Amino acid sequence: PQERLFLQCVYETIEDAGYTRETLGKHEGLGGNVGVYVGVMYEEYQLYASAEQALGRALAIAGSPASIANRVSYFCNFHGPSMAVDTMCSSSLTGIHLACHSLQRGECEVAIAGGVNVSIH
């Protein structure tokens, strides 16, 4: 669900910015050069799978928070860097800071920083 809410949140933002997925830094000819950074502390959604496995049946939910940003890059067709940094209680600013420099170095024309956290276990 962390993936779901963040993905919705990004799309709300792009519209909120007044830019369309097919025109937002689209000045590349193949999708635009947009970077993505997301800060997440941990995923507790696979723990239900382990609990189920201990009780029986068979279920395998994977973590790999890098999905949180890649899916965003996948759906929106961005060709910039995409990562999931993690510093305790300071991921969101770390993600911003990295994006700040990448724009300075010219790697990305536009950036999308943020954070996400939900309590479900």
Instruction: Compare residues 98 and 116 and give the one whose CB is closer to a copy of itself.
Output: 98
Instruction: Compare residues 18 and 56 and give the one whose CB is closer to a copy of itself.
Output: 56
Least distance from a copy of itself to the Cβ atom of residue 11, Å: 14
Binding site for a copy of itself (CB under 8 A): 30-31, 36, 41-43, 46-51, 53-55, 58, 60-67, 70-71, 73-88, 94, 98, 101, 105, 121
Angle at 21 between CA 34 and CA 102, to 5 degrees: 10
**Bridge partners (DSSP) listed for residue 52:** none
Closest CA to 39 of 5, 89, 1: 89
Least distance from a copy of itself to the Cβ atom of residue 103, Å: 13
* Cβ pair 25, 87 in contact under 8 A: no
Instruction: Compare residues 8 and 64 and give the one whose CB is closer to a copy of itself.
Output: 64
Least distance from a copy of itself to the Cβ atom of residue 85, Å: 5
Q: What is the DSSP string of 56-79?
A: SS-------THHHHHHHHHHHT--
Least distance from a copy of itself to the Cβ atom of residue 107, Å: 8
Closest CA to 78 of 113, 100, 104, 110: 110
